[PDB]
Amino acid sequence: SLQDAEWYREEVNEKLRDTADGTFLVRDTKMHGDYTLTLRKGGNNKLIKIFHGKYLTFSSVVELINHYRNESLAQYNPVKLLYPVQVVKEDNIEAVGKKLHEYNTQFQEKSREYDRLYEEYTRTSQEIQMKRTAIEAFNETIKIFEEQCQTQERYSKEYIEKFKREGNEKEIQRIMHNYDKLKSRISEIIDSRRRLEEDLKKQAAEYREIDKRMNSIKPDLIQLRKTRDQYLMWLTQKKLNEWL
Amino acid sequence: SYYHHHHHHDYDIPTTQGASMPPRPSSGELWGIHLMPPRILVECLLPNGMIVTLECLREATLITIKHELFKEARKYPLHQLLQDESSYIFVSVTQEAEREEFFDETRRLCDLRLFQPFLKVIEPVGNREEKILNREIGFAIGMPVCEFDMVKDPEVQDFRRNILNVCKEAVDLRDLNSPHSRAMYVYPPNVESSPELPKHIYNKLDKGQIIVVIWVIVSPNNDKQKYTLKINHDCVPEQVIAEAIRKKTRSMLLSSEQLKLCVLEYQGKYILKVCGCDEYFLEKYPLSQYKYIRSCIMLGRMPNLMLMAKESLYSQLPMDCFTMPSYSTSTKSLWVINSALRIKILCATYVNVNIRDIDKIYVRTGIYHGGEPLCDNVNTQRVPCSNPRWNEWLNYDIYIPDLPRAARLCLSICSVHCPLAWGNINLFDYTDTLVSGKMALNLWPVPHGLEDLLNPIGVTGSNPNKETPCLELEFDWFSSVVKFPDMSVIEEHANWSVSREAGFSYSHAGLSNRLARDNELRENDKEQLKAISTRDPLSEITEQEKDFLWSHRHYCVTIPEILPKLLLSVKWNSRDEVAQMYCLVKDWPPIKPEQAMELLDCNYPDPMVRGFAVRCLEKYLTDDKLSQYLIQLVQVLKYEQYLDNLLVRFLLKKALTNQRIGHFFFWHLKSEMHNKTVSQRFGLLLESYCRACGMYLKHLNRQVEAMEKLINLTDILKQEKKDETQKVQMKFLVEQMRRPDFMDALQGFLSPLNPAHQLGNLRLEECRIMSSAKRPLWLNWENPDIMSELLFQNNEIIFKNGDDLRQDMLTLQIIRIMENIWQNQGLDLRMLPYGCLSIGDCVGLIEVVRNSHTIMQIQCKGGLKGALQFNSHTLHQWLKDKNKGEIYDAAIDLFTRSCAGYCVATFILGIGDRHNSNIMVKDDGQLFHIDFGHFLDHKKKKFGKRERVPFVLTQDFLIVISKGAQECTKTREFERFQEMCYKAYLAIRQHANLFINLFSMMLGSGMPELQSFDDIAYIRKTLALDKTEQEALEYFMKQMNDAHHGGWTTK
């Protein structure tokens, strides 16, 4: 009873990892204390010393905890002990051990999927922003060319109206050629930006889609992991590593 | 019958990275193309609006391009509407997306980072040309400085203007007793912190005497001359400088008295160089204290210094010339406010979830301080998934006055139990102002090995990435801008709470934190406090022990070292308590830096605490010990609440005072500039450093320019030129390296691994791509020192685009520390913490160690022609073949000394399993590991109490340890070795606090192997800190015994 006791340091914190508010268990230098009530409260473990006939008037380790399962801890010092924490009930030893290999291959496949997708996600994050920067650079490039076809018109159409007879079409045609190149280049540039933006959306769509499936994988990755740990908890009540 | 004829229907071999090289990508010389074509067309926009398109060579200078553009524009219209070419400067949009004026017209068309191949011509606007060499700073930083000038945030702008306080103060210290003080900045003495010599070093010294060699140069220069002295180890450079000049200028024409007079005139015109690199001996230290000397003594080497004229030194050091940049109401005390905290959530917008898979989603919240000051709460599971919105006010059971200064709201969107996104806000701003109003917070995704719901340790502030879950919200507004109290005010409330406690009465039920003992505490108490004091940082403290500490908080001032423990015992939700702590910490005894760095990790977020910790460093931490731990101090910056703080002002100043620190401070910040959790912070910091470091900027710019070329080079090799023969690749490599732009950019600069070594003129004959699939480059350079010949004529280091160096970087740093711990305690295990440096996202540099081979090479060379089985002895045979005579015995000592240390370091750190292709042996017999992999046992996240032995000593090693015996496990040679391992294992165990703390400080970086404190907890089990040291040894013996199956059970 005191040895079995249901609930009775690093691996304590791992057993506490991701349980809700209230959850607990009891631990064991002997020249320090005797036992230790570890109690999880809102994502932070809270360690309480047990000093040992009296464990003051409570005559056992099992005595003092049953009292505080019903009740809060506030009256001793300024939350309860609410959570004192399947396997296909396989009384098999060997066949619980192959499930441990198989859930591990499921888990370890599943982790690859989650690990792959995080790269895809993050490369995609980068590649997107690279595009966004490129779009700004395009837009800036465009502005200097817009500014150019402006710039020419002023100094171009001063040298249309001064003189006119001198040069005439031997002047203005070869000035008008230069200008025709200038704007149909801008034409290409603007199309080059558009064509980038469409790709951004298709990228950003896939960006959303990666995350969408990441998030779906996650919750089952935890339960696959959680069942695996309870399976390997049931066995242990050096043989393991080949399955795993 | 193999597969029970089961078909996998989906599997297709039509291209299914399993079938190296994981990061990428990073565009190069032009938008979307790594290397611009060798001849290319460039559209030259003119002042007259004409577009002449020149064909130019890739490698052509803007001087060349302009010079030809103003020829070829004559043949176009409107030529008389252009000024002389000299009245113009080129300009274009870059890949950073910024219009950059091109002043340095010596630059080549490839090296401009150009986006579109085009160039507008203008007359140089903004006549102040020199200050538009922020280009230099923005190149060094790798983001343009104008990207800051257009940031709104006041803090950012406040940081830039106020941090100049620190710059100006540093530059003052530099030109104080110039030129010497300048020379001291640039070429600081490279010295151990201790002048005391370890007993094993002294014994090599012929009762405290070294043979040295001073070299000199006369006329024309060429001829040099040795002057081999035999001086006392603990004499200074000035004394040594004299003894050389004496012997140089003794003569048959000079009386003894005439020498004395010719020495005095000559003596102080000279300083000691090291032959072959830019180390100097610029101040009064025992020669033995300089690092170069102490290495020469350990290696059986005779120091080779050079007498260098102070004026030929102060010739090279140019002026720093620092210039200031162009960037040159009453309130309501928090304690007035009488309400509990409540925070209004509003609408998440961009939440990407399968409504099939996921039921319903909510927002978890909580207030934090590292750990939390109240019950964590959520909101209800509303408008689940399909456009999520909750308009709730969450109510937190803490009064607004009991918020601690350093408090921060943590939040996260969750599923039904599973986290989607996260983000944390500081509850006060950088101006002490309690946050009130509406806030827009864009969120961060949960990382790899993060299962938890909320992420307190993660970075404060919003994501700057727009297209992410933008969860907006609102803060309670108390008609006035609410501020945190003055110190004067908190002192008063402390002294009140003090005297209030003196009149409290007799019994208290849960007196617990009330003493009742008075000024007289019991002797068993004062013993249980030093018992606690000693416990490491990860032995979590019980609520009894916390209140026990918190009661005797005043006797805790007798045991300064208790402070880290004490602080985690304060209740930060009781301003009564917190105010009192602020007064102990005000005048707490400063402590050793090794203990005080604990206080700049995530679990000590308070400003006053962190101040105390910096005050510690300011006093005790030497420039030596700073650069030992600079990685950790730069990492720790991420946990600071605001841009402007004391830790940043300390490090920025050290950086600007000592250029060896500066050098690495640049590179570690610049290393992390890709990572947007820090790009702003570090960018701002790097701007400041760069603006004030003077001429080193220009040096850094060459290093940067060199690394950029190498990154591009390997980016091309790892795409397109994959699936080509090494043969074909190597043609491409050398072809490329020959082009002038590479020759310029790769030839004359300083090693980033150690800017002491210069790099000049790469020998392309010895440059090559190694065999690995990550395509690492093996680069070689002439040592251009005058005395190359005396140190190394060839300098060579490996550049590896593709692998995240920063795990390596840290383990090697840890090894380096274990060595110094061991050695400076007098016990000579010889580890070889080879140089490593990360300079980017999985980009870095690894120091080559000449004359060393992987055990596998040994065995492939020594193994017989008829490929049958490799011999255990070949290692030993290969080793004997090198070391013959009295030399042989000494090589085994070294192998056995190194092998002993690496055995222990490896085991404790839990580094990746060791085998023939990652262990190395040098011609002189020293053993050392490489390619460490995942440190604190990171394959353990699969299954894992594996308390592994990674260095498992096969026969091979054992033979060699016991000269050449049979059944080696039983020699006294091996008894010796075992005792090295036992006295090593313990010596580290005594400094376990440090190692924990060093690992604690690195949790900042997004290393997967260091996500949170139980990662670090592996190092507890393996050092066995919960046990007694007698047990620990037995644990280690046991642990070592089972990996080898016999050997380890006597004492």
Ligand SMILES: COc1ccccc1C(=O)O
């Ligand atoms: C408040 O609890 C802690 C204190 C230090 C390190 C880790 C933890 C934890 O959350 O378990």
